[PDB]
Every structure is written in structure tokens, then in C-alpha cells.
Design a protein around this nucleic acid. Structure first.
Ligand code: MG
Ligand code: MG
Ligand code: MG
Ligand code: MG
Ligand code: MG
Ligand code: MG
Ligand code: MG
Ligand code: MG
Ligand code: MG
Ligand code: MG
Ligand code: MG
Ligand code: MG
Ligand code: MG
Ligand code: MG
Ligand code: MG
Ligand code: MG
Ligand code: MG
Ligand code: MG
Ligand code: MG
Ligand code: MG
Ligand code: MG
Ligand code: MG
Ligand code: MG
Ligand code: MG
Ligand code: MG
Ligand code: MG
Ligand code: MG
Ligand code: MG
Ligand code: MG
Ligand code: MG
Ligand code: MG
Ligand code: MG
Ligand code: MG
Ligand code: MG
Ligand code: MG
Lengths: 208, 343, 328, 132, 177
RNA sequence: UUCGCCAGAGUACUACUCGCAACUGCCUAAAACUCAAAGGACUUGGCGGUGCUUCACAUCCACCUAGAGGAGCCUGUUCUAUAAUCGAUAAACCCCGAUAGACCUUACCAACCCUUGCCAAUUCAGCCUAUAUACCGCCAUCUUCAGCAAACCCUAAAAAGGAACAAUAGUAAGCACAAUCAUAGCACAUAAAAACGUUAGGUCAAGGUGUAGCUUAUGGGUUGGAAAGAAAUGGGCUACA
RNA sequence: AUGACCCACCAAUCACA
């Protein structure tokens, strides 16, 4: 809020500005954008025009960061991606042509898929009624769910590793185990789902 | 220790303690009083008790056409000067301890009956020195405020009149007593009634009115019988110019309802001329001291009737058991005959 | 208060003569602009509030406008609306409504004669036309107004302009016009520069958060960047900062085509990267097309980042963080 | 509530000088400094001396011209001389005013061992900025 | 309104028909009074709060050289004059109401306050108005356009005629010596 | 026109009587004694585990991040302890008066000393003695709350209330808010500002003082002592990797 | 659930001979 409410967020996408001539409503729209004499917030240091940056990877990076260390958290992320990569290159050359067609070597797609699998469907909110606190099944927003996934990943691979064991190691492990749905993270997701079925009657207490 | 000292204003402000929290909620009594005396009041520039005389200050700059030198008074001369100053202080203490007399209205601590003196000139330059004002009721009144808790306003009820038949009353209310006085004066002059006076001493005819819960009952007297009335009514009458009257108030004696009720009543008087005109007859007055001789008071401007009034053998009128009891000598109260001071 | 104004003008003129004399200038060519410099030099008050500093000005500007006398010496009020308590405003309303009726009549006669000869003058939008503020109107009638008052009046002018506009009508509603000044956010292009037989170099200066950066870019060179006399891979060890430096070039696809020298001071590493980022962006605007400039602005490349460290506050810990609060 | 150097709102009758009507947070913004001297500047010395001197001057002047002082004193210090400047009510005959001018200037000159100038500006009644 | 019944010629099928004989009788008197006040150089104030005829009345007044208040009537305008209008002021010598009601259907304040101020009051009191405090009432229809236009025109002409007669008699008095 | 009722409040739909298919009953219905009121309606507040709307933007719930509460230390309270200061002590005390105690500071304790005893003069100096519930000075708090208040005007009477914008009685100067100023350009943010009052809130130990107290002492000096941890606790620091 | 008692508005100036 060193920006007045007048200031719009910038659009960093290069593809949007490069190829305008085929869209009428969007031409009209960004015409109205700049021509409105509209002020623009200065593009943040984290975000780049880079063809290489995944906003999800960056979010995760941030949620991993303790104190002020981007350098250290970006290190750990980088190392983890490299570790998943090399773990799958190991699993590729000791395999046979069929499994060489099957196995995924893109660490990015592995990260994404492993998060999609770990995100909860349904959730729980405490509701006070008649002086008692019941836990009630609540549908969740998308953002809340992605958040729950990432936070659960990091909480586990911070908490449950042996102190000798480094972070990118444990994290690459859990990424690959959650890729295949057998990870402890996924067990947590299921504990939620089961607690949500156990209480399904109480779904009536929710007024919204 | 010279730096350690202060201004007089600071020191007095300090000592008086008018701004404390004691004064606000009335957390201390009104019989406790202390005052501020100027300590520069009697002092002159140059004066000191060492006794010096400075050419520009104590003494004139030139004596006999020359320049006076710096000099000092004799011991006994300074003795006399200090004697003078001490006697000056004692004189100011003699002036301060004398309290001016307050003319007492009804009672010593009542404000009722007291004169405020003429109301203030109106914006047009219009001036009433002919009007007097009397206070009828002053009252401390309260309201419960969100912040301050109890909040004390004075409200006074006042009446003005010139003695010549125009009087009126009004009420005024303010935090300060002085302020409410002003307000109620200046406001009173705006509601004036004209009171018709028979022969300029009494009212015209007997009046009985019930205003809210107050009953006033007035009777019209002859020339000598001065002002026998509730004390408020006497006050108001003296302001109107009504010199001879009898009025008994019953029911609630509440002051505002009394003066409203009274003015309503007096306003509604029906003059002899008005009566003459509505009946279209001569109205003829029989004095007892003048015998059978028929004084003609009012005559009906316009055409007089040739028709006599229907003679009612026995009238149907509302009678007050009080007046009947009075007429037949059944009022034995020890409070009624009492000799009182003059009007 | 009229004698006052007269006198004040007399003495302002006498005074302006005197002042012009001591300052040693021609009394005729003396302006308000000159009066000001003269006082500022004679009575030099540093005080931050400009209204509290010494002023000698024409009494009409100094004193507030006065309601003139409202009635003759006999007591009869001059203006027929006097007793309304607002004559000025209700007159305006009266004449406005009058002109509305007039318009309606005339245009109805022209409806019966088969003539619509007028046009809609109601679009002045390219002139950047707006209505007066309430403050302005209040100054034009020399009278206080109410919000609902102003509202009423404006609504009425709207009713007026929404009909066929007469000449005297157009002129009438146009007292109540103002024009909003220039609205364009287009930047000011740095003129490209040719130096010592070298062609096409441009300059730019970024500032971010205690870091200042001056960047000179050569269009004629290959891709490399020299920051404070060393290579940009050496000066910016962190990937993130190199990506920051990369952002504007990669955005314009100039990534191989330009050769830059930089001077950056103060702040930390990330702040310097940010500074050079902004400066580079501002320097590359000379080489590019006017449209891509708008694009860089819309990517937030050309705006300084206002976010700066807040001052710690006494009785707190961190400029926001509070000392621990004990309930009981 | 901050109370410092404030003149509180009365029933609305209270006469208030331009000085007294401005709370400390207005110093250097609207009202200016009642003293001027080099001492409080960055690299400079003997601030303390000049402060004490100041305090004594206000006290002294207030006692030497009883009742006739309009507003607080103005003390300008320039290259070893102090010009005191005062707003004075007309109370005394000009005899008493000149007597006190001379008396003061000499007295203080010998006290503080520097030339002292005194400048009296005379005023009918306390100049009134507000309320009243 | 109860106090209007003496002025009703009767009621035709639910409508109340004012008695015109009486309207004429009264109107003659109101006009007479208005005129004499005009001749005596005194302030006349047309007052109505009815928004149809507001413009019509403001116009009419300005044409007689008389004043109009057609707008919202500020609270203390008549009673507290010197604060609203100014330090010393003349107050109207006569007040004409073309409608005795305010748009909320209570009596217009100015009636109670003109009475309060000892100012005589002419006014057109329709069938549902309260005539009591009005000095010279003229019963008749205030709602319909030819009626209001009529009453406006009449008071206009009366005023103008009086001011003329005063000019002419003044001229005569000047030639007398 | 009648009839039945009512003469302060309690005591009392009670005690005694008469009558009654009532036998813990109905009916009829006192007094001693106690009080200076008891009652009725209203008004403005405040409050309401009352209802209906609208909100909370670090803020209640939902939610995010880092901590405290457990350990060692550091530093402050409370206790207990000492011959051995004082003050703060819900929010609005608790690294607080102190941006600062080895002697000094220093006010405390114990021994000792000195009595026109800091000054131009003074049957006078001096007092960190009592009262912050006598106060000035500075503040805290409601509070980034929007109101306070003079002068008027209105009300079938007024304790008090005073808006309706297609407007129904309100005008109002002033102070606050607002605006401006500052943070070296705007803007935003932050700072500053924030009336009247509320809490007899804090401070006679910043200084100054009202009232009341001491005067070979409750005053002025010198020398040396002020310990300590059963226990409870606040805030921090460093950690537990 | 709870939270001794007690708390409030009944006095008038300054200045001059
Ligand atoms: Mg007595
Ligand atoms: Mg921090
Ligand atoms: Mg009608
Ligand atoms: Mg009775
Ligand atoms: Mg009894
Ligand atoms: Mg019973
Ligand atoms: Mg019984
Ligand atoms: Mg018995
Ligand atoms: Mg919180
Ligand atoms: Mg920690
Ligand atoms: Mg902890
Ligand atoms: Mg701990
Ligand atoms: Mg302690
Ligand atoms: Mg103490
Ligand atoms: Mg204590
Ligand atoms: Mg407290
Ligand atoms: Mg010690
Ligand atoms: Mg010692
Ligand atoms: Mg001692
Ligand atoms: Mg206190
Ligand atoms: Mg306000
Ligand atoms: Mg009432
Ligand atoms: Mg009021
Ligand atoms: Mg106001
Ligand atoms: Mg600024
Ligand atoms: Mg701002
Ligand atoms: Mg602040
Ligand atoms: Mg502000
Ligand atoms: Mg206390
Ligand atoms: Mg205490
Ligand atoms: Mg003391
Ligand atoms: Mg501890
Ligand atoms: Mg703390
Ligand atoms: Mg109990
Ligand atoms: Mg209680």
C-alpha cells in the first residue's frame, strides 16, 4: 500500500503483447488499459519474463523459505528438482524399453502431478452449536486446496526426516512417492477424507 | 533558586485549584471559598523598602530646572511610607469584607419576587425602561449525559410589565444563572398580553379557571382592598397594574401552570363595553355607597334593544361551595382573618 | 468594510511604489512575480507552511469576497428573491429553469413547423469537459451551498443540455463548464545520442531503495554487461538478479543486440539488480518503437518501485510490530 | 491529551495572541523561534550557556517592566552582541521607558560582558489573533 | 376541513363546491387590502410551496416589483430574521399565500409565523385548508392552473395599479407647490 | 338521575369477632408499632445472555506467519528477608520514573558530629514531612471516537426536543475532525495531529506551590553499610540443531 | 452465579471618587 488503489497489477506475459491483431474484445480491453492513463505497479523482483519460471515452483520456494533467505530456499528447490531428475534417470537406464516408454523424466511434470494428487477434495471447519464444537465437512476453494497440498508436503519433509538426511533428498523422495499415490502425504489426505465421511450427517450444520 | 521561581498567574492558578476534578462533580462544598488578590495593585515602579529615589521613576526628572541625583530617604521617612502602604492593604481588606446588600424577594434565600431591572434594548434601538421584571421561579434542573453524568442547568421563570396593563412571562434556561436571567428577560418582552383593567385598579368581573390541575379563583374588589393573593399573583399584578384583588389557588400550586393559568384567565376578561355590545343594552352599575343612583357604565354603540331581558325568577348558575360557605359564616379558619403587612 | 478595501488599495499602491524604489526597479514594469522575489529576499522566513510566510498582495486577492448591501436606504431589498435567504442560488435556478422552458417552447414550435435544425453539443468529452465543483459554484455566487443544492442545479443543467441547444443556451451552460487538463501518460522519449564517432548510445537512471544506478547502453554492440567495471556474472552471483537484469532485454527480444555499462551504488545486491533493471529499461526506450514503450510500461518495467523501508516507531519494536501486550 | 504550552478553549471569550494560539507541533511550520543563536547548529558550541542566558533574560525583562510586557521576548544574537526586542503595552510615561531602557542595557552589558541593545515596540493593547 | 364548511355552497356527488358569491365578497376585500399596502410602499411577499406554479409565481412577483419565496422555508426566517437575512432588516408588510399548504399537507409554516410576527396575511384557502389564522382569506380552488393563473394575474394588476396611482398622486403633490 | 366505593405507606388477601354442608377454608376486617414518605406517568442517559439490518480488515469466526507459556541465562514484579528508601502496580503496572545505583548518585540504615545553619537583608534560613481526594505543570485512557459549544429561534410547555432534499423548524460564529504542513518532486503511506469530557486515573520525590506539620530537628554534614533466595511470576536473550 | 456502605450542585465579584 505504497500504491494507491488506482494502480493496476502489471501483465508480464510477452505473448499477450506480441500477437494482438487477431482479437477484438482484448484489443478494446488493453486499449482501455493504457489509454485510461492507468497507473501500473512496478513488476516485482520475483516475477520475470523468463520462459523458464513456474509460478507453482516459485510459490513452493516461498513457502519453504525461513527468515529472509530466498537464496537458500531457491537453492533447496533447485537441488530438489535436480535430485528428482537424477533419481528418474537412474530408474530409466536400469529399466527395459517398455518401462523406458512409461517412466517420466520431466521433474516439472512430476512436481505438478504429485501436487494434484495430494490436494484434498473436501475439508473440515469447526462449528459451535449448543456449546459444543462439531467438526463439519466444508467444500474448499481451489487456492485453499493447492495451499493445503504444498504446506503438507513441506511440513512432512521438514518434520519426519532423520537429522542426518538433507532436505532435497527427502523432498525428492516424497515427490516421487506422491506421484504414485503411496506417500504419507496422501495418507494424510485420506485421513481428512475419512474424517469427512464419518461426520457427513453434520453437513447440515453448515449454513453457507 | 532564582530560576526555580515562576509567574504570578501560574502561582495563583496553582493555589486556587479551580480547574481540579473536585469542582466539577461538586466533590467539595460551597461554603469553602478563597480568592485571588493582585499583588501588584498598590505598587509603583522604582519603589523598594531600601528607600531609593531614582530620577526617572519615583521622583520627577528635574527639580528647580536641574537634574536630580540618585538619593535615599531617611529612616523615619521610609517608616511613614511603609505605614501608608500597610494602611492601603488594610483599606482594601476593609472594602473586600463588606458584602453588598441584596433586596430580599419573598424570603432571604429565595430568588422569587426579586427584581432583575429593565430588559435589554431590542435590535431596532427600541428601549423599555418602563418595564420591570420580577423572578417567579428559579430552579436547578438536571439531565443525564452520556459523558458527564448529571448535568446541571438553571431554568428561571420571569415576568415583565409596565404597570399600565401590558405584562407577559417567559422562561429561560442555561448552564449559568446569570445567563438564564438574561435569556428569560429578553424573551419575556416578546410575549406580552394586554390586561383590561376596570377603572384601572381591579379586574372587570369574577374569574374562575381550571388550568391543567391548578384552579385559580379571583374576585373583583372595591378601591381600598389591596392585593390579597398568592405571592406570585401579587407580584404579577403589581407588574400589570392591578391594585385590588382577591385570589385563591387550589389544586397544584406549580408555578408555571399558575402564571400560564393566570394570564389565560385575565386575558379572557369580558369588558363592560363588550357586554353592552353583545346584549345591546345599557350596563348600569349600582354602588352601595352611592345608594340607588344608577351609574351608567356602558352603552351599546349601535342600536339599543327595546326588549327587556327575560326575568328568571330563579337563576341556574354553577355555585362554589366555598363562596356559599363564606357568605353564611361557616368559614372559621384561624388563618383567614390574619393581619398582614401592606400590599 | 468598503472604506477598508479602498484604503488597502491606496496603501498597496503607495507601498508597491516604495518597494520598487528600494529594490531599484522601474515602478511601471513591477509585477506580482517581482513583488514576491522582493519580499522573499527582504523578509526571508523559512516556515514550511507557505500560507504563513510574509505576503504583500492586492487586497482583492487577500480579502474574501463580500455579499454587497442587499437593500436600499428605505429597507426594500433589491433582488426579488431576497427573502429566500439564498438569492444567488435560487436566481440561478430560476433563470436556468426559465431557459429550459424557453427551449421547450421554441423546440415545440419547430416540431409543429417540421424542423429539427439543432444538434447535440452534449459531447465535449475530447475537450476533457467537466462540470464545476461545488467549491467553484460556491465561489461564483459568493454564497455557501449544500450538497443537495449543487446536485439539484447540476441535474437541471443536464436536463437543459439533453434538449436542442440554442446559441444563448449553449453559451449559458458553458459558464458551468471547466476543462480537465492534459491526460496522456505517454513517456518522454530520450533523444538518441551519437558520441565521438560512436553511434547510437542511450542513457537511463534507475533508483530503487537506497540503490542508484546509471546505465549507458550501446545499440552498436554485441550482448554483454559491465557493472562497475566488472562482468555481470561476477557482480551478480545470484541467479535471481541476473534474471532481473535479463527481464527487459528478453522482453524486447534484444537479448543479443546491445552492449551496456553501469554504475550502481548503495543498497544490497537485490536492490542494485532492481535499480539496474529499471535504468536499463528506461535506456532501451530510445532504441525501440513507441508502441513497445507502452508495452514495457504495461509490464511494469518503467515505474520506480515506491516500496521503501518504514521508520521504526517509538514504543513499538519494528515500525509495525508492537511490544507484547499483557491483558492482565 | 497533550497539554504542553497550550491555551485551552474557554467559553469562547478568551483573547489569544498569535503565539499562544499555536501548539508546539506548529513550531518551524507556522510560528517561528523566539530566540536565534548559532549554538544549536550541527558543529557548534556553548548551547548550554546561551540557554541559561536566555532564561535569565526573559525573567529579568518580565520583572523590570512590570505589567507592560505584551508578548514573549525576541532574542537575536549576532557576532557577540544581543539585540533584545520586545512588544510593550503603553503604560508608563516615556520617562520611565527611557529610564528602564538605559538602566537595562547598561546593567545587562556589564553582567554578560557583551554589548546589549534593547528595542521597544509600543502597542495600545495586546494584539489579538483569536476568539474575543 | 371542518372550518371551511361556511364557505361551501354544498357538495356535488362527493366534490365540494365552494360558494362563489362569498369568494367574490372576500376577494374584493383581499385585493383592496393588497392594493392599499402597495400604494403605501410596503413589502409584499408571495408565498407558495407547490411545485407546479413555483416558476409562475416567482415570475409574477418579479413583474410587480414584489418578492417571492417559493422554495423550502428555512426555519427561523420570520421569527429570527436578523440572523437569517441580516443585521437589521425590513420584514414583509403583507404576505400572500397562493397555497396555504406545504407539500406534506400541513399548513405552511409562514402562516403561524406571520401571525406570530403581526403581519397581515392574504391567502387562497382551498376546501381542505385551515383559514383561521389567515387575515383575509379568499376561499377558492388552489389546485387547477386557470385558477392560480387568475389569482396571480389579479394580485399583479392590483399591485401595479396601486404603484401607478401613487406615482401620479405624487406628481400632482409636486405640482401643487 | 342514582347506587357502590375511597381519608399517607407499611403492619394487612393479617389478629380478633359474626355467619357459612366451608374445620390448612371463604367472608367481614382492626390496633400497637415503624416510616417521611409510599405511590402514578414521563424525560435524558446507561444497560439488555432482546429483535432486525450493516459491519470488523491484524480482526471477532473462518484462515496465514513468527513467537510466548516448558530449559538455561538476563532483567522487573510479588512475596518471604534484612538495622536498612520511595513511586508505578486491570485494560491504562511489571528493561516502568532510570537515554541507567560499586563511592557519588541517595532520598534509606547504623554510628558519630553541627545548630541564624548556601543568600544583599529578614524572631529567619532549611524540610525527598503529610495530603496527587487542595493543585499548576507534564501525561495515560476511551481515540483516528466524532463530536463540544457560545449567541438566537421554534414547542396548546420546554425534564427536554429540534431531521426529512419531490424537504415537515431550525440558523449558528468558535474548537475538534477535515484540509495544509513534515518525511526535500507528485501520489500513497507513515509521522504528526485529535476538541469537550470520562477514570477524585498517574505524579507534592522534575520543579513550583494551597492547607496542615517539624525547628539544638521530620534540618545540615562526615564515615561505613544496604545483605539474601523457601517460593510464585512478567518481559526478554540464547537455544534445542 | 456473585460484586458493604458512602459520592455530588443552595456562595458571591472587579473598578473609581
Ligand atoms: Mg435569611
Ligand atoms: Mg522485525
Ligand atoms: Mg388543494
Ligand atoms: Mg383527598
Ligand atoms: Mg394504617
Ligand atoms: Mg384470597
Ligand atoms: Mg383471613
Ligand atoms: Mg375484633
Ligand atoms: Mg491479533
Ligand atoms: Mg526464540
Ligand atoms: Mg516457548
Ligand atoms: Mg521460559
Ligand atoms: Mg519496589
Ligand atoms: Mg510520597
Ligand atoms: Mg505504593
Ligand atoms: Mg489503572
Ligand atoms: Mg550508596
Ligand atoms: Mg553515603
Ligand atoms: Mg531528609
Ligand atoms: Mg488525580
Ligand atoms: Mg462536526
Ligand atoms: Mg409535550
Ligand atoms: Mg438544544
Ligand atoms: Mg456552530
Ligand atoms: Mg507533501
Ligand atoms: Mg495523507
Ligand atoms: Mg500518534
Ligand atoms: Mg488532521
Ligand atoms: Mg486516586
Ligand atoms: Mg498512588
Ligand atoms: Mg515538595
Ligand atoms: Mg524471573
Ligand atoms: Mg517492557
Ligand atoms: Mg454470596
Ligand atoms: Mg453494589
Amino acid at each position: 500500500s505504497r500504491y494507491g488503489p488506482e494502480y493496476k497489477d502489471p501483465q508480464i506475459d510477452k505473448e499477450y503483447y506480441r500477437k494482438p491483431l487477431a482479437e477484438q474484445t482484448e484489443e478494446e480491453k488493453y486499449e482501455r488499459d493504457f489509454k485510461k492513463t492507468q497507473l501500473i505497479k512496478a513488476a516485482p523482483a520475483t516475477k520475470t519474463s523468463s520462459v523458464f519460471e513456474d509460478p507453482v515452483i516459485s510459490k513452493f520456494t516461498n513457502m519453504m523459505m525461513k527468515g529472509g533467505n530466498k537464496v537458500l530456499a531457491r537453492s533447496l528447490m533447485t537441488q530438489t528438482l535436480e535430485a528428482v531428475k537424477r533419481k528418474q534417470f537412474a530408474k530409466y537406464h536400469a529399466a527395459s524399453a517398455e518401462e523406458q516408454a512409461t517412466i517420466e523424466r520431466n521433474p516439472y511434470t512430476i512436481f505438478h502431478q504429485a501436487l494434484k494428487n495430494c490436494e484434498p477434495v473436501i475439508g473440515l471447519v469447526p462449528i459451535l452449536k449448543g456449546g459444543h464444537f462439531y467438526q463439519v465437512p466444508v467444500p474448499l476453494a481451489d487456492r485453499r486446496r493447492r495451499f493445503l497440498a504444498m504446506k503438507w508436503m513441506i511440513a512432512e519433509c521438514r518434520e519426519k526426516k532423520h537429522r542426518r538426511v538433507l532436505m532435497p533428498e527427502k523432498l525428492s523422495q516424497e515427490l516421487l512417492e506422491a506421484f504414485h499415490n503411496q506417500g504419507p502425504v496422501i495418507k494424510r489426505k485420506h485421513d481428512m477424507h475419512k474424517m469427512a465421511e464419518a461426520n457427513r450427517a453434520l453437513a447440515h450444520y453448515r449454513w453457507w | 533558586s532564582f530560576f526555580t521561581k515562576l509567574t504570578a498567574d501560574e502561582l495563583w492558578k496553582g493555589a486556587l485549584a479551580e480547574s481540579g476534578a473536585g469542582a466539577r462533580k461538586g466533590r467539595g462544598k460551597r461554603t469553602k471559598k478563597k480568592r485571588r488578590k493582585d499583588l501588584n495593585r498598590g505598587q509603583i515602579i522604582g519603589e523598594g523598602r531600601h528607600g531609593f529615589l531614582w530620577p526617572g521613576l519615583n521622583i520627577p526628572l528635574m527639580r528647580n530646572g536641574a537634574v536630580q541625583t540618585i538619593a535615599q530617604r531617611s529612616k523615619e521617612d521610609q517608616e511613614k511610607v511603609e505605614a501608608d502602604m500597610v494602611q492601603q492593604r488594610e483599606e482594601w481588606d476593609r472594602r473586600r469584607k463588606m458584602k453588598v446588600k441584596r433586596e430580599r424577594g419573598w424570603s432571604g434565600n429565595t430568588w422569587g419576587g426579586v427584581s432583575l431591572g429593565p430588559p435589554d434594548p431590542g435590535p431596532n434601538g427600541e428601549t423599555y425602561d418602563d418595564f420591570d421584571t420580577r423572578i417567579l421561579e428559579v430552579r436547578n434542573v438536571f439531565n443525564m449525559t452520556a459523558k458527564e453524568g448529571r448535568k446541571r442547568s438553571v431554568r428561571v421563570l420571569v415576568a415583565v410589565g409596565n404597570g399600565k396593563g401590558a405584562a407577559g412571562f417567559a422562561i429561560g434556561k442555561a448552564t449559568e444563572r446569570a445567563d438564564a436571567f438574561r435569556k428569560a428577560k429578553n424573551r419575556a418582552v416578546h410575549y406580552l398580553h394586554y390586561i383590561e383593567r376596570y377603572e384601572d385598579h381591579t379586574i372587570y368581573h369574577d374569574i374562575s379557571l381550571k388550568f391543567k390541575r391548578t384552579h385559580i379563583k379571583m374576585k373583583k374588589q372595591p378601591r381600598g382592598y389591596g392585593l390579597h393573593c398568592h405571592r406570585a399573583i401579587m407580584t404579577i399584578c403589581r407588574l400589570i397594574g392591578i391594585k385590588d384583588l382577591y385570589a385563591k389557588v387550589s389544586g397544584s400550586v406549580n408555578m408555571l401552570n399558575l402564571t400560564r393559568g393566570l394570564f389565560l384567565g385575565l386575558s379572557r376578561q369580558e369588558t363592560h363595553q363588550q357586554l353592552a355590545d353583545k346584549k345591546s343594552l345599557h350596563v348600569v352599575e349600582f354602588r352601595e355607597e352611592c345608594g340607588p343612583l344608577p351609574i351608567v357604565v356602558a352603552s351599546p354603540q349601535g342600536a339599543l334593544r327595546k326588549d327587556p331581558e327575560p326575568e328568571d325568577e330563579v337563576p341556574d348558575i354553577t355555585l362554589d361551595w366555598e363562596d356559599v360557605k363564606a357568605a353564611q359564616g361557616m368559614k372559621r379558619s384561624v388563618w383567614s382573618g390574619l393581619k398582614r403587612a401592606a400590599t | 468594510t468598503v472604506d477598508f478595501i479602498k484604503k488597502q488599495i491606496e496603501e498597496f499602491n503607495i507601498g508597491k511604489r516604495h518597494l520598487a524604489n528600494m529594490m531599484g526597479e522601474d515602478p511601471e514594469t513591477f509585477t506580482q512575480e517581482d513583488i514576491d522575489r522582493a519580499i522573499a529576499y527582504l523578509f526571508p522566513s523559512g516556515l514550511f507552511e507557505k500560507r504563513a510566510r510574509p505576503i504583500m498582495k492586492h487586497p482583492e486577492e487577500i480579502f474574501p469576497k463580500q455579499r454587497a448591501i442587499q437593500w436600499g436606504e428605505d429597507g426594500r431589498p433589491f433582488h426579488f428573491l431576497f427573502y429566500t435567504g439564498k438569492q444567488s442560488y435560487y436566481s440561478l435556478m430560476h433563470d436556468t429553469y426559465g431557459k429550459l422552458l424557453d427551449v421547450e417552447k421554441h423546440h415545440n414550435q419547430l416540431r409543429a413547423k417540421d424542423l429539427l435544425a439543432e444538434k447535440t453539443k452534449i459531447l465535449k468529452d475530447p475537450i476533457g469537459s467537466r462540470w464545476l465543483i461545488k467549491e467553484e459554484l460556491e465561489e461564483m455566487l459568493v454564497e455557501k451551498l449544500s450538497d443537495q443544492d449543487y446536485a439539484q442545479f447540476i441535474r437541471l443543467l443536464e436536463r437543459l443540455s439533453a434538449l436542442p441547444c440554442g446559441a444563448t443556451e449553449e453559451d449559458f451552460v458553458n459558464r458551468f463548464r471547466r476543462s480537465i487538463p492534459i491526460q496522456s501518460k505517454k513517456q518522454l522519449i530520450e533523444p538518441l545520442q551519437y558520441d565521438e564517432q560512436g553511434m547510437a548510445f542511450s542513457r537511463g537512471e534507475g533508483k530503487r531503495k537506497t540503490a542508484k544506478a546509471e546505465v549507458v547502453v550501446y545499440g552498436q554492440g554485441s550482448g554483454r554487461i559491465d557493472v562497475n567495471g566488472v562482468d555481470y556474472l561476477l557482480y551478480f552471483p545470484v541467479t535471481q538478479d541476473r534474471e532481473q537484469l535479463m527481464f527487459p532485454l528478453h522482453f524486447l527480444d534484444r537479448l543479443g543486440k546491445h552492449d551496456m555499462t553501469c554504475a550502481v551504488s548503495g543498497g544490497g545486491r537485490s536492490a542494485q539488480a532492481g535499480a539496474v533493471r529499471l535504468a536499463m529499461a528506461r535506456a532501451l526506450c530510445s532504441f525501440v518503437t513507441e508502441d513497445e514503450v507502452e508495452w514495457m510500461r504495461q509490464a511494469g518495467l518503467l515505474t520506480a518501485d515506491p516500496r521503501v523501508r518504514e521508520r521504526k516507531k517509538p514504543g513499538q519494536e519494528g515500525a509495525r510490530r508492537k511490544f507484547t501486550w499483557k491483558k492482565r | 491529551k497533550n497539554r504542553a504550552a497550550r491555551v485551552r478553549v474557554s467559553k469562547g471569550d478568551k483573547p489569544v495572541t498569535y503565539e499562544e494560539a499555536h501548539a508546539p507541533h506548529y513550531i518551524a511550520h507556522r510560528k517561528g523561534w523566539l530566540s536565534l543563536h548559532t549554538g544549536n547548529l550541527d558543529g557548534e558550541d556553548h548551547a548550554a550557556e546561551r540557554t541559561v542566558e536566555d532564561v535569565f533574560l526573559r525573567k529579568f525583562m518580565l520583572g523590570t517592566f512590570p505589567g507592560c510586557l505584551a508578548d514573549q521576548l525576541v532574542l537575536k544574537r549576532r557576532a557577540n552582541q544581543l539585540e533584545i526586542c520586545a512588544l510593550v503595552l503603553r503604560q508608563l510615561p516615556p520617562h520611565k521607558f527611557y529610564f528602564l531602557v538605559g538602566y537595562s542595557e547598561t546593567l545587562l552589558s556589564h553582567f554578560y560582558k557583551c554589548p546589549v541593545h534593547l528595542h521597544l515596540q509600543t502597542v495600545p493593547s495586546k494584539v489579538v489573533y483569536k476568539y474575543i | 376541513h371542518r372550518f371551511m364548511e361556511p364557505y361551501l355552497f354544498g357538495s356535488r356527488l362527493g366534490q365540494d363546491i365552494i360558494d362563489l358569491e362569498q369568494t367574490a365578497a372576500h376577494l374584493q376585500l383581499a385585493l383592496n387590502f393588497t392594493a392599499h399596502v402597495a400604494y403605501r410602499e410596503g413589502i409584499i411577499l408571495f408565498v407558495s410551496r407547490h411545485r407546479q406554479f413555483a416558476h409562475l409565481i416567482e415570475t409574477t412577483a418579479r413583474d410587480c416589483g414584489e418578492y417571492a419565496h417559493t422554495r423550502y422555508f428555512k426555519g427561523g426566517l420570520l421569527t429570527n430574521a436578523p440572523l437569517l437575512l441580516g443585521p437589521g432588516v425590513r420584514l414583509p408588510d403583507l404576505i400572500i399565500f397562493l397555497h396555504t399548504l406545504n407539500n406534506v399537507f400541513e399548513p405552511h409554516v409562514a402562516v403561524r409565523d406571520a401571525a406570530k410576527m403581526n403581519i397581515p396575511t392574504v391567502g387562497i384557502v382551498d376546501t381542505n385548508c385551515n383559514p383561521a389564522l389567515i387575515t383575509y382569506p379568499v376561499p377558492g380552488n388552489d389546485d387547477s392552473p386557470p385558477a392560480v393563473r387568475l389569482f396571480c394575474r389579479l394580485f399583479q394588476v392590483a399591485i401595479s395599479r396601486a404603484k401607478e396611482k401613487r406615482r401620479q398622486v405624487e406628481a400632482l403633490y409636486r405640482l401643487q407647490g
